[PDB]
Enzyme design. Structure first.
Site, short mmCIF file in Angstrom:
data_model
loop_
_atom_site.label_atom_id
_atom_site.label_comp_id
_atom_site.label_asym_id
_atom_site.label_seq_id
_atom_site.Cartn_x
_atom_site.Cartn_y
_atom_site.Cartn_z
CG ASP A 1 -2.32 0.59 0.94
OD1 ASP A 1 -2.35 1.80 0.84
OD2 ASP A 1 -3.41 0.00 0.86
CG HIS B 1 -5.30 3.98 1.08
ND1 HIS B 1 -4.98 2.74 0.76
CD2 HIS B 1 -6.80 3.74 0.89
CE1 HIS B 1 -5.96 1.88 0.12
NE2 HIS B 1 -6.80 2.53 0.16
CG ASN C 1 -13.67 1.28 -3.90
OD1 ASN C 1 -14.04 0.28 -3.24
ND2 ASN C 1 -12.54 2.01 -3.49
CB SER D 1 -9.32 0.45 0.40
OG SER D 1 -8.76 0.36 -1.00
#
Length: 279
Positions: free
Chosen positions: A39, A69, A161, A224
């Protein structure tokens, strides 16, 4: 063990019903397992990680998470308050820059890095990788995820998404990894969650409280956020000896809460991750 006033998603993964707020789990808590968070990095100094998180690799000028994130996802895997597997070891691999973007070539390198790097770590209960990232279909990205899984790592990936069929996204569309859709606190498919036959499981993904950079916390939404619930669940179940890296996705599907989500398109699994912990 019982954590009162837990984030709703933690309570959900240990419950046969929505609408409760206590998370129940075996005290082994993923001890002896390892989860790689591939990530934007992890703020390992966050008190919520208790010294159990570290950065092991970056492809950029820093290994620090300048975005948040990756720290949020890592918190859902394994932070003391916000995490599923509260005693796992967390390893950060920074394939995404501080704007949250990354080239597929870097992402592929990061996956192959984890497949080898696990041999440099002590993970007697097993190894998981959480990939809250993706873009358009790429056979090379899918193949990298397949290699990582083949090497003995439970790979969990975000469905995406786009409120679209995940077959058109990578690594979501790789059949051999665990592709995770998102649900909300009322057991509805999250409005943005991708769907399709390639999904294996749903996890909590709308309004998920976790760690953030600057030693902070916040609630955000996405596939996520659902992915690290499943990654942490796998680590927890592997520590219990109930499954292995190669079989954990199937085991999670076998033991999921079934038929309880709304707005699941015909042809997409109606399966919600569940730890089946009996206190």
């Amino acid at each position: 063990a019982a954590q009162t006033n837990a984030p709703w998603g933690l309570a959900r993964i240990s419950s046969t019903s929505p609408g409760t707020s206590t998370y129940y789990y075996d005290e082994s808590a993923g001890q002896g397992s390892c989860v790689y968070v591939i990530d934007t990095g992890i703020e390992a100094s966050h008190p919520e990680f208790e010294g159990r998180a570290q950065m092991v690799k970056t492809y950029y000028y820093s290994s620090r998470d300048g975005n948040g994130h990756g720290t949020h996802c890592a918190g859902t895997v394994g932070s003391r308050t916000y995490g599923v597997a509260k005693k796992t070891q967390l390893f950060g691999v920074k394939v995404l820059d501080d704007n949250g973007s990354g080239q597929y070539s870097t992402i592929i390198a990061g996956m192959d890095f984890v497949a080898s790097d696990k041999n440099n770590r002590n993970c007697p209960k097993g190894v998981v990788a959480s990939l809250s990232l993706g873009g358009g279909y790429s056979s090379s990205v899918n193949s990298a995820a397949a290699r990582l899984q083949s090497s003995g790592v439970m790979v969990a990936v975000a469905a995406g998404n786009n409120n679209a069929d995940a077959r058109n996204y990578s690594p979501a569309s790789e059949p051999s990894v665990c592709t995770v859709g998102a649900s909300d606190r009322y057991d509805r498919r999250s409005s943005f969650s991708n769907y399709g036959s390639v999904l294996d499981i749903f996890g909590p993904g709308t309004d998920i409280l976790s760690t953030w950079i600057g030693g902070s916390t916040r609630s955000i939404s996405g596939t996520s956020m659902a992915t690290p619930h499943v990654a942490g669940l796998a680590a927890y179940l592997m520590t219990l000896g109930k499954t292995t890296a190669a079989s954990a996705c199937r085991y999670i599907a076998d033991t999921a809460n079934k038929g309880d989500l709304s707005n699941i398109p015909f042809g997409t699994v109606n399966l919600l991750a569940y730890n089946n912990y009996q206190a």
